[PDB]
Design a protein around this nucleic acid. Structure first.
Lengths: 385, 385
DNA sequence: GCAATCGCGTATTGGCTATGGACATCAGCGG
DNA sequence: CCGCTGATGTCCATAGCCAATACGCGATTGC
DNA sequence: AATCGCGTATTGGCTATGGACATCAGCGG
DNA sequence: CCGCTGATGTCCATAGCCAATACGCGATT
């Protein structure tokens, strides 16, 4: 009656990849993967030793799929862009494997996936430097990260364009980002922790900072209450003296980020009245907030699925309203850009800003915020052609 | 058995004053006052036309009590500060009568109460100008408001000092505030509504602004969902497509103000490391937030009793932590001041900033924020002598 | 092309609390 | 001591208001 | 001079899931 | 009809989230 397909491992791996993409590593039970393949958990143990081994196999398979879709001597970015775009469109879902799921692996696998990502970014940087021969290494790295984040932003949503419109949009955005002239010399800053200790002036602030750091480093389901308490110097019952629960801490982080973004948007709107100056002010405020609180940005990017329904819905609605304001300004500045193209460009720019803000070594230069804002504005305005 | 004291209306008025001070005018029923006076509700109608007449009588009685406590040619502030301080210490619980309960009266009674308050402030300004005869009208008005707000702050909490320490503290604070040299000139601002309209970029923002304005103008129990919907341009039931309930708007306003204050405090802490500059930066951030959002300040001052328990508790705890940071800085700068004196001075400065921020005609000058910050710092630092 | 959403006026609806009429009782006074 | 007209308490009910949630009606958008 | 909540460190559950013996087919000779 | 490969039954171990109880405070009425 029941037959062994002799390819059980491939089916189990495919189901695990799908479930990890959809719901996450901790929220997907082994029996869920087994049922998706019409087996039980002990069959998976017959095929894989551990659940973590299954996750590592899934992440490696996703990276191999991206590499195969990518399909030697470095060539100008204009020559390689079409291939890069095709690969990106085909692999849009799998971004979370390396970006979020890989967070849960052991040190060796994390180092391996980090090496793969760094090699990809280095190839993109080589292409960018071949496109513009006269560029400082920091500027070349920034433009390479801009191109990479623009290509990777497709995995943060489900929007698309009919026909070859999406490819044209991505090509224009990447080429405009790459060919942006430098705005400052970008000198390395002398190289903080004292300011970080000073800004934790209460037990509530210390617990909030410890929770945000632990959520960014490990993940919400993987952080104990005792870990947050130790970060604050107490036990978990101390955290429950200060908070109602850990979901309360997550909701507090999300609400704090939302309110800060709203305040910066209000200030930017009140400061300027013309379209260009207003868009520049909004981009500058977003960059400022992203650079000042990388942990909040990382939490909002990753752990949003574990927050309360009302908090998540409100945060998403407010972000959508601010993005709609951005799209209206973009459409005013560039009449050719439509609304779908506008939101695609806005998502790409936001992804670039957030990705650069989280990386530490990219933000160790004087006046890097101006460069980030200029690159984001170039990406947003690339719709002109 | 039952006895009619023939002075029943005086006891009814006393109980009404006590209940109006303790809790809101809308939060006490006529049955509560009647029970406190040992009578039934219609017995009150035998002595008063309605509840609004009783409220007006209570407010007039409180103002008359303050006037009697105070008791010609104006005298220098140093020769009248003893009397004013005594009057304030005696009338501290009565202040809310002409500050919150006044909004529920008729137009004529509101104008009469405003006239009484303005006459008191004008007498204070005359005393201040007699003390320092080298001040422009704007500076004299600002210093008079500083003194009046210091006394009103003393009439805002339950803190006190043993013996004549409180009188000495208030005298020093008022004299330091009055004797502050002008920080800068105050040219009248050329005279927006355009900035008040574009910042409402979504239905949620419009509803929030309308709710805040209505709560400030009338009070939380006196505003129904119909007015908020009309301010947003929709029907009353349409408000629930964006909010869970009417209390959700108040909770959102309180949370927004708390997060904005927290962000400004964090920025001020990170900007400066020395004690004096750090305290100046904290005061400047508080002044900036108070001046930019007067409606939020008014809501937090008045309608806080109608918010959720958790939201109110969190807001109070965060404000207490920030004020504790202020008190630590004050104690570092001035070794003489103790913790309780620091609490009193911080309350005085905060009340001064909030009172000046809410008044519209006082803020129509160029660089008034610097003068407000200077006066607040003069109040806070006072205590060296 | 058509069904699933989506705002948006209206329409109820279950408290809830100022008022209020009918009736009742103390107050001191004038024989 | 005792009626005897003021003034001053109760007892129970009613009317209007005000969250908050039902409908139905249109217009739009994914399939 | 009692009297008090205020933190603080264990303490004890209740509940999910990951992993695992024992039995179990199937699938090529 | 047989020896290897895969599967299915329950089952237990153990971690993690909230309460609950314990003494000291150090300030409060």
């Amino acid at each position: 009656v029941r037959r062994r397909p002799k390819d059980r491992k491939k089916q189990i791996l495919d189901q695990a990849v799908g479930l990890f993409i959809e719901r996450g590593f901790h929220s997907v039970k082994l029996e869920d993967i087994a049922e998706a393949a019409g087996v039980t958990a002990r069959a998976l143990y017959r095929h894989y030793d551990n659940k973590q081994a299954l996750l590592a196999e899934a992440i490696r398979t996703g990276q191999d799929q991206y590499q195969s879709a990518r399909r030697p001597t470095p060539r100008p970015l204009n020559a390689d862009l079409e291939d890069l775009i095709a690969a990106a469109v085909a692999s849009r879902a799998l971004t979370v494997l390396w970006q979020r799921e890989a967070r849960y692996l052991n040190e060796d696998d994390r180092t391996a996936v980090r090496r793969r990502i760094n090699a990809i970014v280095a190839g993109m940087r080589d292409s960018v430097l071949l496109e513009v021969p006269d560029l400082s290494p920091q500027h070349s790295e920034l433009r390479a990260w801009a191109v990479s984040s623009t290509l990777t932003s497709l995995g943060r949503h489900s929007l698309s364009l009919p026909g070859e419109e999406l490819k044209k949009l991505l090509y224009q955005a990447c080429m405009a980002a790459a060919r942006t002239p430098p705005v400052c010399e970008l000198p390395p800053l002398p190289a903080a922790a004292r300011d970080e200790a000073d800004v934790l002036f209460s037990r509530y602030e210390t617990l909030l900072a410890a929770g945000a750091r632990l959520f960014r480093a490990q993940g919400y389901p993987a952080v104990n209450t005792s870990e947050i308490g130790k970060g604050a110097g107490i036990a978990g019952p101390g955290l429950y003296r200060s908070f109602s629960s850990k979901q309360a801490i997550l909701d507090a982080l999300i609400r704090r980020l939302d309110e800060w973004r709203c305040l910066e948007c209000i200030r930017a709107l009140r400061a300027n009245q013309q379209a260009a100056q207003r868009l520049r002010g909004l981009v500058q405020g977003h960059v400022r907030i992203s650079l000042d609180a990388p942990d909040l940005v990382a939490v909002s990017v990753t752990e949003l699925s574990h927050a309360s329904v009302e908090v998540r819905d409100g945060y998403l609605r407010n972000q959508g309203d601010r993005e709609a304001v951005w799209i209206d300004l973009i459409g005013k500045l560039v009449p050719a850009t439509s609304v779908a193209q506008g939101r695609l460009l806005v998502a790409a720019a936001i992804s670039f800003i957030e990705d650069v803000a989280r990386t530490w070594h990219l933000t160790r230069y004087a006046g890097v915020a101006d460069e980030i804002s200029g690159l984001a504005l170039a990406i947003l305005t690339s719709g002109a052609g």
